[PDB]
């Protein structure tokens, strides 16, 4: 039940939700409640991770993959991209999020804000970029990072 | 007292206010005051709610729906969407806020202040994101979220 | 006196100034020095005020409209819009700005920044929104926001 | 040595930098280098200044104009506009920049140290606005305000 | 030791990453893993650096050029631009980023943040500008600014 | 806040409730439920106030008139009468209620608990008589007296 | 968070596990492993709930239904039975566990710690009774009780 | 950064250095310079490792092979041979070097600190032997052993 | 900081001063004011510097050349001469001063006056020689010697 499991759980629910919204509406006669299920048969995902501190990141990525397969996901339908550092996560995510096949992208990384001097500037940028990216491209982007 | 009732009331008033300005002007030879009546007949709304603290959130949604119907709203013209967490609200509001039918949307959530660094960055982004979306689509968004 | 006195003065100098900037280009003998006059006739205005802390906002609006007429402003060319809460001022202001008639907007607002939690976030985004509109819409606005 | 002289020097050579940049591509057969010269003949500038604290601001504005003429600039090609406060520098700056003939802009101002609360909210916004305008207008603007 | 080396290495492989991600599609049963690579034949670069503290920056500029050529780069395909300030880099980088024959941009400078004036504000602003340009234009940008 | 606000709101709720019971039953095959909406259009009301302590009463009664118009009431359909003192409140209310036009009645007054021996008697008398008239006439009569 | 969620999830896993063992063996000619996925499609369930502590038991029962339907369960494949006493579950559970259609049973209840010696005997007997049913009848059961 | 990565880097560029050195003489009309590039494609290497202390040596050998593939080397052109002790590294190294196809050799090992007397006699000889072989064979060999 | 910059700036404008003073005459009623100017097109220069303490002087030589080219100078019209001592500059400057196609001369060197031998005497002598040459030949000479 590591934090990587949480990111996968959030990602799966949205891919179903947006499908329901884009689909045909209800028959009326009451409040149109829209909900996202946990099924994962026929959903494609993407993941981005940083090389830095590969001893503490390998566990996170591995735990995330177990969530999809257990909930009914084929291992063949996952794409993995690795980037040098945390600063480069947003730009990489954009290329993945713009593909037609992909339906969700997860973000995994570790932060050293406070662990090293002069890092709060970089720390705020990644959080701001990923959220702002989601609105323009119309697609859920789960967020996950650790503090060192 | 409960923020659910208070937030919905604000949404009702601004819906009428915008309809007045988009129409004809007021009487001349005087400073035309503008105010929003509290009636709610003929309008359409939407709601987005999170799931953290499942016990507490249920009360808030009940208050919001009660105020809308009590002031003359039709239950047939309310749509509800549920999301996993607080980070996820801004993207959900995007889909609803830009439909040609809806007139206003309400966001309900719970924020944690200072518990862990992870939640600290979440609070800043959700506040900024909701405001910018409203200014770009010309519809009102009500920020009815509790803290702690 | 009150901040409404100072706030009104700045707006008056601006509307005419922009008129000069779009004036005839028949010059160049020496360096130009553009400046704003203090005439008020033929200048439309808009004013927006909140509702919380009614005991204060009443004097600010009362103590601000006087300066407009004192320069020759006609009361028929002023429009006022009341709004429920401070956090939802900017959305209303944008609607009035897009009207081709009005040439200036001023806002009254009382904030308790740095008093209690859940209000610092509100106190932060209010200023940022108003500034953004001015550059986008190209019409001056005055930040007539006070605090306890 | 004052900010007025130093701030201007940035303006002269970027006007030369952009002119050469959009004139030709890579020469070929060797590394390409682009550089700006400190020559002012044939260039037209613009300057914006604040009304408040006219004592200090008087010296700074005088210094900036001295540099332009010294390096070979004609005084007939300089436009100066005054504003009553720092808050309105960004909106005014955009007006001059959109003019096709101007080739660069310079900003002068003075900031006070904590006379009243929430000054930073006003103080920080001017810096943020200037940077945003430069990128979208694609024309340099200098930053030469001085703290009190 | 040379941070130009560290910045240069990151830029080289990101160009390779984009070369493959947006390349021809592929079909297979196993998971697809996309990884960077240090190979710099057929890649076009561009560098921007400031004069500020010219004693130190001149050293770093040489280091970046050494990395490209040693790793298979071509001196004929490197373009260099020099500017007089740290505040004044983002505007320059914009023009280079839009060239259709440029694959990456490397930005290096010096910050003396601390008790010095004007530096607390601009230090934050320069970072945000670079990040936004990357997502807007979909092209990597590296941040190799060192501080005392 | 103003206790007249509360007393006013209760009047509308009761008026609609009796307006519905006279009609036909609701949908069968379930539990019949009757609730009062807050719409306040097309309803006639009456108000009674005591002249003693005109300072507090004036604000209190003004706090009640706004409610009917704000919730969609016609401003020219509420009657007002005043009486020398508290003792005269019941008889005045009795006169109004018998009319075939007024649908609800509101009472306003200010009292001090047991200031003098005779003040104790009136306190019991004023409440006792008011309730009895409501049952006899079959018409709601709100209670709005203030103690101390 | 609630025990109702945890109890339901265990039932989902066990049902899949038993369907695998009772089936044919797998290939590979190596070390062989079994595990239960979390797909609830096509499985039938049943629940038994007590009545003490009216406030809480309903909340726990609600969560259990959500888990089954979210993970692919059908609304009309669940059977519910309600009984008064915590001492009274085992007799009810047996009547349901022996139906051919049912494939799992979930028990929800509340126990009291140390209130009286009478309840001490109650608590011991209920736990061991349910265990014996599972082994005797060869069908999984879940133990979703709370105390204090 | 480890000796495995650092030791390899020496190997790649000398293979390039010798290839260019024996290709042409002095160009003439200017100073002649000979330099090696960090390109590995088209080159075949050899590696020798010690059996003892397999824990530490496992990481170093893994690091060296990572560098070759990263810079563009094919894994099919790498030969690894193990030996039981440091004393036999020189004799084994000569065997690989005399092979005509190999272009360079790399040595890895770990030395303990004074477990038994006269260790220096054995310890020093390996370093001396490696240097002697290089001169007479006329082929580079790297030195990458690490003390305990 | 670079004293070569400070020395260079003085030399540039003095050449302009002589260009106008001995130019064509003029007639007028007001006072005539002759002023220098920073404009270096069509001006021929010449630099002399010493090897003494070659670590530092090489830096200054570059600074002087940068000033001339940036201010509109031409590299084709700069002549450089190097000598081995501070005592030995004046003789070298004499030959350069007599060239009919030279407008100014810049002399830079290092003095280590103090407890060192021979330096109290020569330090005075070198200064006098330069001054006398200027008046004798009627051509400006600049003194940019720095000392520890």
Residue numbers in the entry:
A (entry chain E), B (entry chain A), C (entry chain B), D (entry chain C), E (entry chain D), F (entry chain F), ...: 15 to 162
Quote the paper.
Further increasing NaCl concentration to 0.35 M yielded a mixture of the tubes and ∼28 nm spherical cages ∼44% and ∼46%, respectively. The 24 and 28 nm spherical cages are composed of 24- and 36-pentamers, respectively, and both have tetrahedral symmetry, resembling those formed by the previously engineered AaLS variants, NC-1 and AaLS-neg. While the number of pentamer–pentamer contacts remains 0 or 1 without NaCl at pH 8.5, judged by the 2D-averaged cryo-EM images, the mean contact number per pentamer increases to 3, 3.7, and 4 in the tubular, 28 nm-, and 24 nm spherical cages, respectively. The bonding network observed at the 2-fold symmetry interface of AaLS-wt is approximately preserved for all the interacting pentamers in the cpAaLS(119) assemblies. In marked contrast, the (pseudo) 3-fold symmetrical interaction interface of cpAaLS(119) assemblies lacks cryoEM density corresponding to the N-terminal α-helix(120–131). The α-helix(120–131) domain is structurally disordered and unseen in cryo-EM analysis of the cpAaLS(119) spherical cages.
Cryogenic electron microscopy revealed that these structures are composed entirely of pentameric subunits, and the dramatic cage-to-tube transformation is attributed to the moderately hindered 3-fold symmetry interaction and the imparted torsion angle of the building blocks, where both mechanisms are mediated by an α-helix domain that is untethered from the native position by circular permutation. The native terminal amino acids were connected via an octapeptide linker using genetic fusion and new sequence termini were introduced either between residues 84 and 85 or 119 and 120, yielding cpAaLS(84) or cpAaLS(119), respectively.
